C-alpha cells in the first residue's frame, strides 16, 4: 500500500489511518463497467500541487472532508476534481457522460480523471450540497465555484491558509 505518490498532478502524503486495496467492478453513469481497485480504510493526506494544497480526509469509497486553498478559481476546482475522483466515490463513478475510451498507459482512475478534468459540470452538480456550520478559517464553496458561508459541496470547505 502507498503512503507518498502523486495523483492528478498532486503529490499526496498519508498523515494517518491504513488501507487494503480490493479489484471491484463499479458502473459509469452510462453503463460502462470499470475494474477498479477499491481502498478500504480511513485515512487522511496532505495534497500539495503548483496552484493548490489540500488536506482529505476519505474513508472506503466516501470522501469525508477536503480543506482547499489555492490560487484562484480554476486551481481549487482542479484539486476538487482530483479529490473527488481520488476518494472513488460512486457519486463520481456515476457522473461519467458517454464512454471512457481507451488510451495507452491510462487506467480506470485515470480515464476517469481526463474525463472531469474536461468538463466537470455534471460532476459539481450531482455530488451533493450540505449545510454547513460557521467555522473559523473555512467557507462553503457551490456546485458555480461561488462563496457560501452557509452551504457548500458536501465535505468540501475552502480556506485561506
Ligand atoms: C484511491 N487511492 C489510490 N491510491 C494510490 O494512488 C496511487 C496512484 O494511483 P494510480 O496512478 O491509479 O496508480 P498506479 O501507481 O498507476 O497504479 P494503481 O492505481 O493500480 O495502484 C496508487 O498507488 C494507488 O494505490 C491510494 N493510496 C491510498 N493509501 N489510499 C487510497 O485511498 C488510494
Redesign the pocket.
Known sequence: ???S???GGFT?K?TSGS?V?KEEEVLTGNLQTLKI?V?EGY?EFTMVGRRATAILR?ATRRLIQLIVSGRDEQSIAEAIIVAMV???EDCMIKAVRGDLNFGSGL?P??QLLRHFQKDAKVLFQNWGIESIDNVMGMIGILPDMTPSTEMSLRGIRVSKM
Open positions: 500500500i502507498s503512503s505518490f502523486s495523483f499526496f498519508r488501507s486495496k481497485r481502498h485515512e476519505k481520488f476518494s472513488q487506467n482512475m485515470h
